[PDB]
Amino acid sequence: CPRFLKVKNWETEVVLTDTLHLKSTLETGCTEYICMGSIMHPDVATKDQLFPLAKEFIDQYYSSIKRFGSKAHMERLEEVNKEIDTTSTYQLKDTELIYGAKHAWRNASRCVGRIQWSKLQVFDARDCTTAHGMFNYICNHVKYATNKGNLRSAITIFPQRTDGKHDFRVWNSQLIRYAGYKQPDGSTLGDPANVQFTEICIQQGWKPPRGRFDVLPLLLQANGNDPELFQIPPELVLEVPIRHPKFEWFKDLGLKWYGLPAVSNMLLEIGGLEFSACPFSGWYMGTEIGVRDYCDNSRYNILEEVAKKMNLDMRKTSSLWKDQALVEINIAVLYSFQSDKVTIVDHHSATESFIKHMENEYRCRGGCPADWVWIVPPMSGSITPVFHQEMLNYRLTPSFEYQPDPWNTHVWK
Amino acid sequence: RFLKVKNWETEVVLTDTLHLKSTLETGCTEYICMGSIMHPATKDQLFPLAKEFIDQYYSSIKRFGSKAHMERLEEVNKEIDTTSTYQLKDTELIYGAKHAWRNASRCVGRIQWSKLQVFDARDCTTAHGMFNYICNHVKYATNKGNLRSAITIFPQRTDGKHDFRVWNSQLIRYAGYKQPDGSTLGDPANVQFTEICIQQGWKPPRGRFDVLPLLLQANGNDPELFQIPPELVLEVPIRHPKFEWFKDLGLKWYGLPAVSNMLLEIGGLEFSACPFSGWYMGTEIGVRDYCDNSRYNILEEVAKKMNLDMRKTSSLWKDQALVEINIAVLYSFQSDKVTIVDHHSATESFIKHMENEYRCRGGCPADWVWIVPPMSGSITPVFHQEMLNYRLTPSFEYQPDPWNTHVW
Numbered sequence: 001c002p003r004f005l006k007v008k009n010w011e012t013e014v015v016l017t018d019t020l021h022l023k024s025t026l027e028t029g030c031t032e033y034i035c036m037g038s039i040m041h042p043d044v045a046t047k048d049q050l051f052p053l054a055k056e057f058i059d060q061y062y063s064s065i066k067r068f069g070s071k072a073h074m075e076r077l078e079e080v081n082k083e084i085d086t087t088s089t090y091q092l093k094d095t096e097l098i099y100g101a102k103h104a105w106r107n108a109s110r111c112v113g114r115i116q117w118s119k120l121q122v123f124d125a126r127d128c129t130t131a132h133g134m135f136n137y138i139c140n141h142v143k144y145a146t147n148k149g150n151l152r153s154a155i156t157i158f159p160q161r162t163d164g165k166h167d168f169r170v171w172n173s174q175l176i177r178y179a180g181y182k183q184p185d186g187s188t189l190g191d192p193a194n195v196q197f198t199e200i201c202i203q204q205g206w207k208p209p210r211g212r213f214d215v216l217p218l219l220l221q222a223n224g225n226d227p228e229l230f231q232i233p234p235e236l237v238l239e240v241p242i243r244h245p246k247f248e249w250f251k252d253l254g255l256k257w258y259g260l261p262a263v264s265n266m267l268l269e270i271g272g273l274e275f276s277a278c279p280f281s282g283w284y285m286g287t288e289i290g291v292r293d294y295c296d297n298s299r300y301n302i303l304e305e306v307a308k309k310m311n312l313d314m315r316k317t318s319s320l321w322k323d324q325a326l327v328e329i330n331i332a333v334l335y336s337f338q339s340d341k342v343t344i345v346d347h348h349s350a351t352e353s354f355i356k357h358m359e360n361e362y363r364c365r366g367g368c369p370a371d372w373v374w375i376v377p378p379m380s381g382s383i384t385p386v387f388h389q390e391m392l393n394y395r396l397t398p399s400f401e402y403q404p405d406p407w408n409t410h411v412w413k
Numbered sequence: 414r415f416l417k418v419k420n421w422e423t424e425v426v427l428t429d430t431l432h433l434k435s436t437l438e439t440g441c442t443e444y445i446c447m448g449s450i451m452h453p454a455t456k457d458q459l460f461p462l463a464k465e466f467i468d469q470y471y472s473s474i475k476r477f478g479s480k481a482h483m484e485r486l487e488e489v490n491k492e493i494d495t496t497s498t499y500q501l502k503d504t505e506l507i508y509g510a511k512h513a514w515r516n517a518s519r520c521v522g523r524i525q526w527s528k529l530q531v532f533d534a535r536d537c538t539t540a541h542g543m544f545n546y547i548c549n550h551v552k553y554a555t556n557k558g559n560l561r562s563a564i565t566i567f568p569q570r571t572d573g574k575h576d577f578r579v580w581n582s583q584l585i586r587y588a589g590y591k592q593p594d595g596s597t598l599g600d601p602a603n604v605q606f607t608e609i610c611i612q613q614g615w616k617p618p619r620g621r622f623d624v625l626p627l628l629l630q631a632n633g634n635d636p637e638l639f640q641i642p643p644e645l646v647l648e649v650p651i652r653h654p655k656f657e658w659f660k661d662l663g664l665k666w667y668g669l670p671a672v673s674n675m676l677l678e679i680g681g682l683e684f685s686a687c688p689f690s691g692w693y694m695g696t697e698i699g700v701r702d703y704c705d706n707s708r709y710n711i712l713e714e715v716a717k718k719m720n721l722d723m724r725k726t727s728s729l730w731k732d733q734a735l736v737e738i739n740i741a742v743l744y745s746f747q748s749d750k751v752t753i754v755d756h757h758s759a760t761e762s763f764i765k766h767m768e769n770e771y772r773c774r775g776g777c778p779a780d781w782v783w784i785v786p787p788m789s790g791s792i793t794p795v796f797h798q799e800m801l802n803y804r805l806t807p808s809f810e811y812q813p814d815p816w817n818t819h820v821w
C-alpha cells in the first residue's frame with residue numbers, strides 16, 4: 001500500500017490526502033483484479049487470536065486519551081493479558097466500551113450521518129441475564145432516544161459472546177418495524193420486507209392484528225436461550241402520519257411511519273470481543289422512508305397510486321411520472337415529520353454535513369473511510385455534493401458487522 | 414473461484430466466470446476499495462498482448478488453433494521483429510472496436526454493442542484528412558435524427574512523438590467564456606479548451622451555445638482549427654410539454670454525443686484518436702449538463718419560474734426542478750424525432766443485457782457507480798443489481814489532455 005492516497009472532489013476541485021487506510025484491519029472483498037464495492041455482503045476467538053486484537057484496541061484507546069506508553073496503559077495491557085490467559089476472554093472497562101462504540105460508528109463507511117459520531121449515549125447492559133431484562137433495557141433505550149420527537153442517538157450493549165452457545169440476540173432487524181402478511185392470493189399486506197420475521201413471530205405465539213402498519217413484537221434471545229416475545233408499549237412508539245403541503249388528498253392514502261430508526265441485527269466488534277446484540281438508533285434521512293420504504297417495488301410500492309392521484313400520464317416511462325411522484329412523496333415525508341416536530345434530515349442537508357465531516361476527519365484523523373455506493377442518496381444523486389466526491393473504502397476496527405439471521409443458526413432448546 | 418451477483422429486487426442470481434480472464438488491474442486492493450475513484454511499448458511486451466488478442470479473435474470465430482490462426486500469429490511475430498509493431502486486419506479492427514465497447518464497464522448502453530459502424534481511418538496523414546473523416550462520421554451517425562453508433566479509428570501510436578489526437582473532448586460541445594465579473598458564459602466544462610481555440614485564432618461569437626471548432630492533431634504535429642459545417646450539427650431546442658415559459662429559457666442542446674478524447678487499446682496497439690458516438694440518455698443533458706454546479710447550473714432559474722419555495726432545502730425544490738428539466742429534454746428530442754433514451758428504459762435494457770452476457774459470456778463487467786443514473790437511482794432496476802467490475806481488453810482508456818504533453 002502507498003503511504004498517501006489522494007481523493008478529489010470534482011465539483012469543488014478540493015483534494016484530500018488519506019493516511020488512515022494504513023490502519024486497515026480487514027479485507028474488503030476487492031482484489032487487484034476485481035472490485036466488489038457494490039456487492040451487499042462480500043466457534044469463537046482462541047486465546048492466541050485474541051491477544052493481538054486486544055492489544056491493538058487497548059493501544060489505540062490509550063493513544064486517543066494521550067496516555068500512550070503510560071503506566072496506566074502498560075498496567076491495562078498486563079491486566080487484559082492475565083484475563084485472556086486465565087479466562088480465554090476479557091472484560092472492557094466502561095470508558096473503553098463507550099470509546100469503542102463511538103468508534104465503530106465513526107468507522108461505519110456506509111453511514112452518511114457520522115458527523116454526530118461523538119454524541120452517542122451508550123447504555124451498558126452487560127449485566128443483563130434474561131429476555132425480560134433485555135426488554136426492560138430496550139424500552140428504556142426507545143424512550144430516551146425518542147425524547148418526544150427530539151431524537152437522540154443511542155446504543156444499548158448486551159453481554160458479549162462467550163462460547164457461541166450463549167449469545168444474546170435481538171431477532172428483530174429493527175426495534176420498531178411493521179409486519180408483513182403474505183395473502184393466499186399472492187398479495188402482501190403491510191411491509192413485504194418483514195414477511196418472514198412476521199411469520200416467525202406468529203409461530204412463536206404472536207396474535208397479529210393483520211393491518212398495514214402493525215408494530216412488530218420484540219423477539220429477544222438471552223444467554224443462548226430460545227427467544228421470547230414482548231409487546232413494546234404503544235406509548236413508546238412515536239409515529240408520524242404522512243400528509244402533503246399541497247395535496248390535500250395525500251392524507252387519504254392512510255400512510256404513516258415510525259420516527260425512530262433503531263437497527264438491531266448487527267454485531268459490534270471491540271478489541272476482538274463480539275457483542276452480538278447491540279441495538280443502536282439515530283434519526284431518519286427522509287429518503288430512507290420516502291424512496292426506499294415507500295417506493296421500492298419489493299416494499300410498500302406506492303408510486304403507482306400516488307401517480308394516479310396526481311393524474312400523471314403513466315403510459316410512457318419517458319414522461320418521468322415515477323420520478324415526479326417520487327419527489328412529492330419525499331416532500332410529504334419531510335413536511336409531515338417537521339410539522340410534528342420529529343427529527344428528520346433531508347438528503348441535501350445530510351450530504352452537505354457529511355462532506356464537512358469527511359473533510360474534518362481527513363484533517364484531524366488522516367482519512368475517513370466511505371462507501372460511495374451507500375453514501376449517495378437513492379434519489380437526485382448528482383445534485384448532492386457526495387456524488388462528485390471521490391471516496392476511499394476500507395475497514396477500521398472497532399466496527400459494526402453483519403451476522404447471520406439468528407433463526408438460521410439457533411439450536412432450539 | 415466462481416462469483417455470484419444478486420439482484421435484491423427480483424432475487425435473480427447470476428454466476429460470473431468471465432472475471433477469471435482479466436489481466437489488468439482495477440485500482441482496488443484487498444484492504445482498500447477505490448470503486449469511486451474516477452481514474453485509479455516494446456517488442457517483448459507487444460507480442461504477448463498481440464497473441465492474447467489474436468487468440469480471442471480466432472476463438473470468437475470458432476477457428477482457435479486453425480491453420481489460419483497459426484499463420485496469423487507467425488505473421489504478427491515477424492512483423493513485430495522487422496517493424497517494432499504490427500497492423501490489424503480489418504476484421505480484427507472491427508472485432509476489437511466492438512469488444513472495447515462490450516467491455517466498457519461504465520457504459521449502460523452496451524446492449525447495442527455489436528451494432529457499431531467502424532470507420533477505418535488508419536490511412537490518415539493530416540489534420541485536414543482528420544477533419545474529412547470526422548465530418549463523414551458526424552453525418553453518418555447523425556442520420557437526420559435517427560442516430561447510429563459509430564467509431565472512427567485514426568493511425569495507432571508509433572513512437573509517441575507522432576500521436577494523432579482529437580483535442581476536443583467531444584466532437585460537438587459548446588464553448589465556455591470566462592467573464593470579467595468572475596462568472597461564466599456558456600459551458601464551464603470547456604472554458605480551458607475554448608481559450609486554447611481563441612489562442613489559436615478562433616473567433617468566438619461569445620454566445621451561450623457556440624459550437625466549438627474541431628482542433629485536430631495529425632502525426633504529432635501542431636493542432637489545426639476546423640469549423641464543422643453547421644448543417645451537420647443537429648440541435649434540439651428545449652421546451653416543456655406543460656410549462657410554456659420553458660422555451661423562453663433559451664436552452665438548446667446538440668443531438669450527437671461523440672466522445673473524442675479516449676484511447677482505444679487492441680492487442681497492445683494504442684489508438685489515441687478514436688472518436689466514438691452513440692445517442693444520449695436524457696439525464697446526461699438534463700441532470701449533469703444542465704444542473705451540475707460546475708456546469709450550466711440552471712436549477713435556480715427553473716425553480717424561480719416554477720415559483721417554488723427555495724428558502725429551505727427540505728422543500729426539495731431542487732429535486733422538483735430537476736425532474737421538470739428532464740421531462741423537457743426527453744419531450745424535446747422526441748418531438749424532433751431525435752434519438753434519445755430515458756434512464757428507466759436505458760437501465761432496464763442494461764439489466765436485460767447483463768442476463769444475456771452472463772448466459773452467453775459467463776459475465777459482464779459493470780461499474781455500479783457509473784451505471785446507476787444520477788437521479789431517481791433506486792427506482793431503476795440497476796440500483797438493486799449487484800455488479801462485479803473488472804477490466805477486460807480490448808478497452809477504452811483515459812489519456813492525458815494533449816495540451817499537457819504536446820510541444821509546439
Ligand code: HEM
Binds near residue numbers: 108280281285374400
Ligand atoms: C444520527 C443520525 C443518523 C443518520 C442520519 C444515519 C444515516 C444513515 C443512512 C441513511 C444509512 C444508509 C441506510 C440504508 O440506506 O439502508 C446508514 C447506514 C449505517 N449507519 Fe447511520 N445514521 C445515523 C446514525 C447512526 C448511528 C447512531 C449508528 C451506530 C452507532 C449508525 C451506523 C450505521 C451503520 C453501521 C450503517 C451501515 C449498515 C449496513 O451496512 O447495512 N448510524 N446511516
Ligand code: HEM
Binds near residue numbers: 520529562690691
Ligand atoms: C448507443 C447508445 C449509448 C448510450 C445510451 C450510452 C450511455 C452511456 C452513459 C450514460 C455513460 C455514462 C457517461 C457519463 O455519465 O458521463 C456511458 C459511458 C461510456 N460509454 Fe456508452 N453509451 C452509448 C454508446 C456507446 C458507444 C457507441 C461507445 C463506444 C463505441 C460507448 C462507450 C462508453 C465508454 C468507454 C464509457 C465510459 C467513459 C468513461 O470511462 O469515462 N458507449 N455510456
Ligand SMILES: C=NCc1cncc(OCc2ccc3ccc(N)nc3c2)c1
Binds near residue numbers: 261281288
Ligand atoms: C436490509 N438492508 C441492508 C441492511 C442490513 N442491516 C442493517 C441495515 O441498516 C441500515 C441502517 C443502519 C443504521 C442507521 C442509522 C440511522 C438511520 N437513519 N438509518 C440507518 C440505516 C441495512
Ligand SMILES: C=NCc1cncc(OCc2ccc3ccc(N)nc3c2)c1
Binds near residue numbers: 456457
Ligand atoms: C517478438 N518476437 C519475439 C517473441 C517474443 N515472445 C513470444 C514470441 O513467440 C512467437 C510465436 C510465433 C508463433 C506462435 C504460434 C503459436 C503459439 N502458441 N505461439 C507462437 C509464438 C516471439
Ligand SMILES: C=NCc1cncc(OCc2ccc3ccc(N)nc3c2)c1
Binds near residue numbers: 690
Ligand atoms: C465527465 N465525465 C468524465 C468523462 C471524461 N471523458 C469521457 C467521458 O465519457 C462519457 C461518455 C462516454 C461515452 C458515451 C457514449 C454515449 C453517450 N450517450 N454518452 C457517453 C458518455 C466521461
Ligand SMILES: C[C@H](O)[C@H](O)[C@H]1CNc2nc(N)[nH]c(=O)c2N1
Binds near residue numbers: 037373375
Ligand atoms: C446492489 C446494491 O449494492 C444494493 O442495492 C445497495 C446499493 N446502495 C445502497 N445504498 C444505501 N444507502 N442503502 C442500500 O440498501 C443500498 N443498496
Ligand SMILES: C[C@H](O)[C@H](O)[C@H]1CNc2nc(N)[nH]c(=O)c2N1
Binds near residue numbers: 388
Ligand atoms: C466521485 C465519482 O467517482 C464521480 O463523481 C463519478 C460518480 N459517478 C458517475 N457516474 C456517471 N455515469 N458519470 C460520471 O461522470 C460520474 N462521476
Ligand SMILES: [Zn+2]
Binds near residue numbers: 037448
Ligand atoms: Zn473495489
